[PDB]
Amino acid sequence: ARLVGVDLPRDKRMEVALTYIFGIGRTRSNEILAATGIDRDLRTRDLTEEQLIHLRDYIEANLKVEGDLRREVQADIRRKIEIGCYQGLRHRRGMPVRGQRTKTNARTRKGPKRTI
Amino acid sequence: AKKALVNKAAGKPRFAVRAYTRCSKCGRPRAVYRKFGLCRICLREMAHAGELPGVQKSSW
Amino acid sequence: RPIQTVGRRKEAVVRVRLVPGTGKFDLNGRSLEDYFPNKVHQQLIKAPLVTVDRVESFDIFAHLGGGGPSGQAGALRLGIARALILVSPEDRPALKKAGFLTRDPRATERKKYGLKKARKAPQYSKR
Amino acid sequence: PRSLKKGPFVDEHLLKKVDVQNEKNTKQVIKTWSRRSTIIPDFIGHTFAVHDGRKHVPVFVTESMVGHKLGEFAPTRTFKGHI
Amino acid sequence: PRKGPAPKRPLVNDPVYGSQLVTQLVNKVLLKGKKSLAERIVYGALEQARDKTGTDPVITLKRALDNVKPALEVRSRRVGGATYQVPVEVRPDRSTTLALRWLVGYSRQRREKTMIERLANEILDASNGLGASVKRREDTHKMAEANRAFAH
Amino acid sequence: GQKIRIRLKAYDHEAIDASARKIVETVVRTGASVVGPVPLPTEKNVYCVIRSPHKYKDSREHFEMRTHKRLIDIIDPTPKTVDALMRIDLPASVDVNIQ
RNA sequence: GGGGACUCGUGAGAGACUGCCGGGGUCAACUCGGAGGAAGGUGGGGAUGACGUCAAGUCAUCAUGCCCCUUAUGUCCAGGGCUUCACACAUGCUACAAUGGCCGGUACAAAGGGCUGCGAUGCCGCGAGGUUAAGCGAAUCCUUAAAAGCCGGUCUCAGUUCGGAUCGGGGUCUGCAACUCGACCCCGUGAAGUCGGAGUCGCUAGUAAUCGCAGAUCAGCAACGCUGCGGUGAAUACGUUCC
Ligand SMILES: [Mg+2]
Ligand SMILES: [Mg+2]
Ligand SMILES: [Mg+2]
Ligand SMILES: [Mg+2]
Ligand SMILES: [Mg+2]
Ligand SMILES: [Mg+2]
Ligand SMILES: [Mg+2]
Ligand SMILES: [Mg+2]
Ligand SMILES: [Mg+2]
Ligand SMILES: [Mg+2]
Ligand SMILES: [Mg+2]
Ligand SMILES: [Mg+2]
Ligand SMILES: [Mg+2]
Ligand SMILES: [Mg+2]
Ligand SMILES: [Mg+2]
Ligand SMILES: [Mg+2]
Ligand SMILES: [Mg+2]
Ligand SMILES: [Zn+2]
């Protein structure tokens, strides 16, 4: 029972299980289930082949998921980098890009302490 | 404050968003109450002197 | 001339109309269970009328307001005690000994400048 | 100005300094201070000497810098790795 | 303090079980002012104990408390160039307080799912004399015994 | 009949009350229906400022500004009474409005 | 409509003084315990800082003695900076979950703000929001839905339906203007973190702990700061050896 990835964690309800798709969160999962017809309170174990085929087509009909979405994100980042903008410069330097504070924080953009 | 800045504030500036309030008595730019037009200092001395009707020390 | 009293606990005010009847609580159109579902509250109210007497008898309906549920419960307790004193003064010593006629002055202490709360202070941190 | 009811924002002095040249030729550097102007799909091929606080930097609007600002290609601060 | 003892506060009987023991229990479980939640947890634990043993829950609780209550504590002191433990008697109300604290503290860190069943299991094991709460009392007694020399 | 309304406001007690019941209550001899002064809840504007001119944040001082409101009376719009109402003048510390 | 009953609003008063009783004490101060009382020994809290100390802080609130500048160290303007970042410290917020997360229903506050303003209702939008517009300088209108709480359902101990950083895309509003450098909304992304070494902090009761609300500054930025307001509501104090 695979959509693109495995997406069949052992004994998960369908709305939560769908979030394991890279590109679907809770809201996307809720509208997927509402659109197809499968109820949220239903385990991924008890999913039929026809239910799977219904919810399969509808994700590439509308949404964007593993692979192409991951390509588009890095495409945007790379475009910013070689266009020569301020955000791209900060992407190259490995610094926060949305105007954060770098005096005492930014420990996610930077790694752990380097202890000069 | 400086008299040039006090005059500039009193005037009518370009881009009305630039208008800011200064203390009506001393010309302080910071901590100016709208209801009095005074800074916190000048407010404190005037209130103690009793020159501000209705204002008095507060205990509760 | 009905027996009307009042009781206050923190900021809640309860107006009681102690009245002869079967024994029943009406709390702006609700029963005692509807308004105060907590058993501790249900004991706190009608603790006074059972501390001596008596015991499930003539009913009450009272207006509620202000404070929180526990404060309203305490205010209702005080109002019931005051109403019982008014309607039958003989058991005044009993309720006074039980301590149900004290208004219980305990208000929220005001915040104080330079502190996080009424007493809580920021970390001292010598050096 | 950053809301889809008023369109993009360009300074009028910058617009009338580019639209009375692009109609005939790709004008050389336009010395300007208007970092806050967004690049519209008419600055293509032009070049701007944008102020950075101390000097003017030439920027060539090619194709993809059509939604950003003139200032984003004129860095103001200088940091070079304390050590 | 320095100016003698302070007045302690009184408690009222629990409505469903006419005891102050369960009132002290709910006040030990209470956190963040959630007294209704603490009462729910205690009531659920007592009901699970009753449904598992048949016996009256407050009687089971009294048995558990009698099992875990200590008699000698080990207050520390320093004399010269060394500090060593001094065994002293425990007064009854402090013993009850300490036993309740031990029960709740050790049930909070039991390997189960909900606090209701954690606390019920801890109470049953204590009443049987098996739990870590009983182990704590035994360790306290052993340490008070192995230091009788310093009973000045 | 139920037309004229008064709106006394003042910064201090001991002025608004007297300014009402010994100045506006001179219409009882004129023959006007008065319900008397009706005290409205007092207002409190508060301010908290730093005492020092520099750098001592933890030392502050509070100030109030109270407003007292009463006499919303419903005197009859008799033309001879309104004569006295408008020809009487009162302390400035008390503010009076006619509705 | 009406009523003066209840609350409340705001004015004037009463009340608490060891006043009364028992014991102690030079019969004195005073102390221990009772009675009556809403309250009992300073009822709780606030305002209130003696003589002085630290050549403590402020010449950047203001004032001011001497010194210094006067095509500049005065004054105007546009961009930039005050927001940097191998690190270090300090004060906080959010967490590491089941006394919990999410969903559905439902109850109970106080104190404040509002004409260059608050926008009820209706219509559009998933939402931030857009438009029309009743009423309201306000105990009468808006702010106003308090949240924890209670009931039910689900999740079943997992780096998770915990956590919400970072980043991608698309937007709303304020403002001449949102790149440097605004807040907020939607979709996606889902990091560290599984309770914290030596050490160290606050708190004795409506306190601590926890939950929301309001104001000032303010075009916007404060639901992490400050000043306040209420809701729920504990555990301990043997004692003065030690710090
Ligand atoms: Mg401004
Ligand atoms: Mg509080
Ligand atoms: Mg000095
Ligand atoms: Mg200095
Ligand atoms: Mg000066
Ligand atoms: Mg000077
Ligand atoms: Mg400038
Ligand atoms: Mg700064
Ligand atoms: Mg979550
Ligand atoms: Mg909910
Ligand atoms: Mg709608
Ligand atoms: Mg998660
Ligand atoms: Mg990890
Ligand atoms: Mg875990
Ligand atoms: Mg430690
Ligand atoms: Mg603001
Ligand atoms: Mg903070
Ligand atoms: Zn001033």
Strand tally of chain A, please? 0
Order of strands across the main sheet of chain E = 1-4
**Which structural class best describes the helix and strand composition of chain E?**
mainly alpha
- Helix amount of chain A: 40-55%
* Most extensive chain interface and residues per partner: B-F, 15 and 17 residues
Give the biggest beta sheet of chain A.
none
Task: Write down the overall geometry of chain A.
Answer: elongated
Oligomer: part of a larger assembly
What global shape of chain E is seen? Answer: globular
Reported for the largest beta sheet of chain E, the result is:
2 strands, antiparallel
Ligands bound here?
magnesium ion, zinc ion
Describe, in short, the structure shown.
The PDB classes it as ribosome/antibiotic. The structure is cut from a larger assembly and holds chains A (116 residues), B (60 residues), C (127 residues), D (83 residues), E (152 residues) and F (99 residues). Chain D has one helix at residues 12-15; strands at residues 30-32, 47-51, 56-60.
Could you explain the architecture of this structure?
- The PDB classes it as ribosome/antibiotic.
- Keywords: Antibiotic, Methylation, Pathogen, ribosome, RIBOSOME-ANTIBIOTIC complex.
- The entry is titled "CryoEM structure of A2296-methylated Mycobacterium tuberculosis ribosome bound with SEQ-9".
- Chain A is 30S ribosomal protein S13.
- Organism of A: Mycobacterium tuberculosis (strain ATCC 25618 / H37Rv).
- This is part of a larger assembly, with chains A (116 residues), B (60 residues), C (127 residues), D (83 residues), E (152 residues) and F (99 residues).
- Chain A is mainly alpha-helical and 116 residues long.
- In chain A, 47% of the residues lie in helices and 0% in strands.
- Chain B is built from two helices and one strand, in the order H-H-E.
- Chain B has helices spanning 3-10, 40-49, and one strand spanning 55-57.
- By secondary structure, chain D is mainly beta.
- In chain D, 5% of the residues lie in helices and 16% in strands.
- Chain D is built from one helix and three strands.
- The radius of gyration of chain D is 14 Å and the shape is globular.
- By secondary structure, chain F is an alpha+beta fold.
- Chain F is elongated.
- In chain F, 17% of the residues are buried.
- The C-E interface holds C 38-40, 42-43 and E 12, 15-16, 35-36, 39.
- The complex binds magnesium ion (17 copies) and zinc ion.
- Zinc ion is lined by residues 23, 25-26, 28, 38-39, 41-42 of chain B.
- The site of zinc ion has 8 residues of chain B, from helix 2.
- Chain C binds one RNA strand of 243 nucleotides through strand 2 and helix 4.
